[PDB]
Amino acid sequence: LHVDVPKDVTRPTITTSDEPDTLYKRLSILVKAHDRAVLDSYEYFAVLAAKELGISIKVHEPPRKIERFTLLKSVHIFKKHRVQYEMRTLYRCLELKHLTGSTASVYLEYIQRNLPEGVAMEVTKTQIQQLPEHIKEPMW
């Protein structure tokens, strides 16, 4: 818009509670897809997004998996003639570190909502908490 611009855009209400926040030591995001290039674009989008919010991120590529199975080519007889098919799964692991629970929800929502079609995520949060109050003191 050249001359017509919003004046005071409405922004969502974020209210700070009195409950303490979760502390995630680690948060592993294993995305899976049949296409490597899609993971590269998502890897770029996710790493850029993490860096813009202050999150610490590392990336590695777990080894790909290929599943192959054989079928019978003819509708009837002709056993020796087969057709083989395969499915390829490719992985990109985004290992985040030292995240509070508010930072991990907003980031995961933002990147989960923008997950391309054909891509599956496997988040593995690792929370750190104190010891149970009973365990802290031995009681007979």
Binding site: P12, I14, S17, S102
Partner: protein, 154 residues
């Protein structure tokens, strides 16, 4: 020594989408989002604007008619969590017995003539009717002025 843990912020389920929406502005070279994004399907005039948004509503009403008339085909629910707004609607009373409870159903469904028939039948038998229930009948009749609620069908 004791670490100070930050107080967790909380927000509504739509808060994140609302934040992303605030960033984007109107596209000056595009028609309203309701209209289909295609040169062949973009409304040239103001008539085609209204006519395109009346054929779209017409198809929506044609689909809801099929769903609400053959509900047995649209009853399998495979959505977890369950989506109430994507289930067939039922507006005809399913309580057959003539009781104050049955009258309350008709009042809830907003049928005006059927509720009057069952209310009169309740009076014919003489069964007690709660003043609150009798008021829910008057509310429906007074608001709709004794006429069945407006609706469109074949």
């Amino acid at each position: 020594e004791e670490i100070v843990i930050p107080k967790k912020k909380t927000w509504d389920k739509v808060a994140v989408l609302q934040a992303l929406a605030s960033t984007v502005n109107r596209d000056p070279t595009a028609a309203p989002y309701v209209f289909h994004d295609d040169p062949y399907l973009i409304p040239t005039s103001a008539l085609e604007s209204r006519s395109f948004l009346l054929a779209k509503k017409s198809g929506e009403t044609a689909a809801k008619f099929i769903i609400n008339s053959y509900p047995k085909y649209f009853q399998k629910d495979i959505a977890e969590p369950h989506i109430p707004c994507l289930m067939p609607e039922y507006f005809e009373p399913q309580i057959e017995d003539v009781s104050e409870a049955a009258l309350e159903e008709r009042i809830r469904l907003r049928k005006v003539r059927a509720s009057v028939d069952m209310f009169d039948q309740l009076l014919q038998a003489g069964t007690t009717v709660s003043l609150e229930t009798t008021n829910s009948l008057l509310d429906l009749l007074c608001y709709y002025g004794d006429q069945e609620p407006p609706a469109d069908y074949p």
